RNA sequence: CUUUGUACACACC
RNA sequence: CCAAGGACGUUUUCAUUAAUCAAGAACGACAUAAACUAUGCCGACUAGGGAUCGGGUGGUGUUUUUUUAAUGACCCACUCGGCACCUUACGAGAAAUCAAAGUCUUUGGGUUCUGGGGGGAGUAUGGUCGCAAGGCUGAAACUUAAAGGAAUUG
RNA sequence: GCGGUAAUUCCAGCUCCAAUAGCGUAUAUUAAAGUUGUUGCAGUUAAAAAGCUCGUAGUUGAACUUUGGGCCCGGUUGGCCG
């Protein structure tokens, strides 16, 4: 009978099975555990301000040969170290 | 219906049990054959000869309906009836294929042997399975000389006989030619027999 | 079905279509009712009664000869047992298997079949309690099983 | 075990019509089978059928026409209100001009059109087209 | 089928099988049309006068074309004792 | 010049069958393309995609192009052809030829009240090719063909103004979804509806009636 | 009753505007409308059809300049 | 076979099947009336006798039980009733 | 040259 | 020697006593396995064919005993219940293939369990059982654009 | 995926494109997603049938009991009559 129960009085079984299999997705578990609140560097926020600590010359992965001109900053609200990539050409002379 | 001159007359019945057409197959039995009639000890079966006669007058009424007599094809790859289908070819329009049936003969317009008929007649559906399969592609009716164990798929009118005997195949093919010759109108005498002996439609070893 | 095995074999009786039966039997109804009470006076289960009237005399079923069935007239005549026959045969088979197990400890498939037999016993006991042919609080235990065979 | 007798009945009809046979045996014949085949018969889908009775439950022999595409049961019998009738006929019918959803109401077992005419509803049994 | 007031629509109303009463598709290349000539009191068939029996590809592929052809031949009266209703 | 070799081709060369509906009526095998573009002069062609196919050998990789072509006229008749070829222009050429030999009709119907001309399909239908299933549902007037643009092009070449489409499986395989759509639009004339419940007098074949303008 | 009231209101409104012809009043030619019938009833194209502008753009700069 | 009469099967094939697989199920067994040598005392014995059936007057056992039809003894005279 | 196995495809380096 | 079990036969008896099963319990080369049919259980229907195992029915069938009876062993025909095997595909499937892995977009017979891209990882921790080894339940941080299945050409 | 000295992909010019007083980016969420599956998924080989059996809760569970036949009354859709 295709797996799941089909009786007219079996809504509880379907609800609890749907909860247990809802925990198997990635976005639902990430939302409900509050992982954006806890383990994200931004704390769930879209943007974050920070103080630049230093500059890095991060290499590009394979197959690609370049140096990506990143910076290491420290966030104001949490205080953890964060690597950020300065986007465009010659902009590393602006973020000293 | 029929005007009751086409019943199984006793002399033709004497020919049919002279040729041992009623000696069908063994206890192996296709379930689509209700022609079995007092299944005999030793395991061989006896068929309703009257049912064979009504199926044969059905086949004659099928063949007589087609206007052009050259649009019927007689198949023989079994080695026991090429002479019979050749005499059918001589006596009617009836284009034959005796021996190897080339694939792509009813399809494949390019080939030199391209026929496309309105009827095909076979002897053994098991041996002539390629002809039956090619008739199934081009919307072609099939008349067959079936067995009690023959693979009757894609077969429209199946005349129950035995094709394991030398006499029965040729003589049944002879009655088919006889009845279609009466139905077309060259054989004007319904009561009188045909002057051609059935011994013409036989296979000989040299 | 066959819950305690895997067999799917069908083998049973085919009761005839004639509810009034069989127009060659000449005995009366009261003759066979006195036959059942005389035969059940000497201590026979109703299955043995049914087969013994089925083969010694011409009785197709006692349901179609009389107006009613067998232990209906036994309980009307006061010969109904304190427990019916199927549960009684199950518990006597159980105490026989338990006697084998107390005799031989290592017959371990006999342990498995003992659990099967007590499962059937508990299912029939539940069914007989909810229809109250047995009183509620009636329970099967082995010490009362040794004496409940009677 | 054998739970829905009507389901096995309609499955037998479906298999016999898919194979092309013009007759079918049904065991073991509840009342709702008789009403279901009466509803399918009055709309020209099957034709004549026969109630064999043994003394246990009965058998049905149905003569089948070529007019049946699919008959089916809905399990469990959901409660259907007025708006759920045309939600169901939107859900599981081929088109809006033919096909019948069968439901049992307190005024008997009937198709969705005459249930709309009687302005009654009930529990959904199955469908036929 | 029709629209509201006349003007017959539905080009190519299709043929239906004489055995299982299902319709025959346009590319059903196994379907056949048996044409049987009838006889008028002389043992000879008349050219142009037929009875006609259409068989679909499914019944022909299952091998059941000959039993069904027996049934419709005996139903029209031109056959006498080959097919039995009681099997 | 044509010079056909078929009885059907010879009869349509003679002008004996004046419309294509006898061919599907009597289920005749269309066998040469000139029958199709003689009887149906109004059909257009469109080629959907050209994909390179590779057969790897011991010495390089042999390249050919697989071209799919959908042909048909915008009332009733649709054809689909798929042909691989070593040259691309021959691939569209053999594609339009094969698509001409595969012409099938469409059951166009009404979503409701049967007022004017038929705009949608008569029934829901489906087709499956490979892992791809395509479902077509009748839609009300002015809804349009709501479909991916390939099968939208197919059913606007068919003659439908409006239909609902559903898909399942790996629909990015273009040949499989076009063949599934072809099967779905071919099954519209496979369904038996109560307006077709009436019996017909089983018409006689044109292959038999005009048999002396035939091949022999 | 709901279908009758709202349908008669809707075809009354659409034939009042002019996007729907007076003989197409069967509630399903409403489903057969196109956006060009709406686009034909703007004041731009009406000023064009009345012959005061000789173009749609002259109609636009005539309308917007009061 | 695609057209057949399920209402009226032939007698041979309906006697061919299992007893539960017919149109209506029924028993294939029967009752005999048996006379034993000596005293007359006509008895009715079921075919699958399931037990050692004897005459009521004296121990003159007529059938012995067997897993199918029960065998009857050497001196009997039985009829099908 | 057939069959067989592959996780090889810039292909047993 | 002891009890148990299936199928068969049955015009014997009960009367719906049932199907699947969290917890729990028994057995398991302490509780595991490539414990596999890598295919949960129950129920119904749908194409065949022959062989085989257990039982039963019939055939003046064959043979043996006491030529001859009953048996038994064969043969023939059947039927029920099994382990299976072979051919096709109306059907299913991505294919290999499948009489079930079919009756599933024309989507519902009943029910239990499990899975949601690949690693980290059956790892850490917390419980729980075990003398122990271990068994059961069992994450996350982080990392990656593929891993993988079936077939075709070399 | 482009760039290793002939870059249609970078930095600019020219040209063209899309939306337009608006347009891009980040984050979350919804549809797409039949990748949460009641409708409506999958478990032989791709992730997944608990080793097997008993068994409580939970879910589900054979058929059967008034049917048919008549007699009237009055509504709605129609229909010539308009």
Residue numbers in the entry:
A (entry chain c): 2 to 97
B (entry chain P): 2 to 207
C (entry chain Y): 2 to 151
D (entry chain b): 2 to 130
E (entry chain a): 1 to 87
F (entry chain R): 34 to 249
G (entry chain W): 67 to 132
H (entry chain f): 2 to 82
Passage from the reporting paper:
In addition to the native sample, we generated an Otu2-40S complex sample in vitro for cryo-EM analysis. To that end, we reconstituted an Otu2-eS7-Ub-40S complex using an in vitro ubiquitination system. Herein, purified 80S ribosomes were monoubiquitinated with purified Not4 E3 ligase, Ubc4 (E2), Uba1 (E1), ubiquitin and ATP to obtain 80S with monoubiquitinated eS7 (eS7-Ub-80S). These ribosomes were split into subunits and purified eS7-Ub-40S were incubated with purified recombinant Otu2 to ensure efficient deubiquitination activity in this system. All described structures were refined to a high average resolution of 3.0 Å for Otu2-Ub-43S-PIC, 3.3 Å for Otu2-Ub-48S-IC, 3.8 Å for Otu2-pre-40S, and 3.0/3.2 Å for the two bodies of Otu2-Ub-40S. Further insight into the role of Otu2 could be gained from our in vitro reconstituted Otu2-40S structure, which shows that presence of the Otu2-NTD alone on 40S would sterically clash with the 60S subunit in context of an 80S ribosome. Most intriguingly, α4 occupies the binding position of LSU protein eL19, that forms the functionally important intersubunit bridge eB1270. Helix α4 of Otu2 occupies a very similar position on ES6e, most likely involving basic amino acids including a patch of four consecutive lysines and arginines (Lys116-Arg119; BP1).
In actively translating 80S ribosomes the ribosomal protein eS7 of the 40S subunit is monoubiquitinated by the E3 ligase Not4 and deubiquitinated by Otu2 upon ribosomal subunit recycling. eS7 poly- and monoubiquitination is antagonized by deubiquitinating enzymes Ubp3 (USP10 in human) and Otu230,33, While Ubp3 preserves the eS7 monoubiquitination, Otu2 was shown to specifically remove the monoubiquitin attached to Lys83 of eS730. Here, structural analysis by cryo-electron microscopy of native and reconstituted Otu2-bound ribosomal complexes reveals that Otu2 engages 40S subunits mainly between ribosome recycling and initiation stages. Otu2 binds to several sites on the intersubunit surface of the 40S that are not occupied by any other 40S-binding factors. This binding mode explains the discrimination against 80S ribosomes via the largely helical N-terminal domain of Otu2 as well as the specificity for mono-ubiquitinated eS7 on 40S.
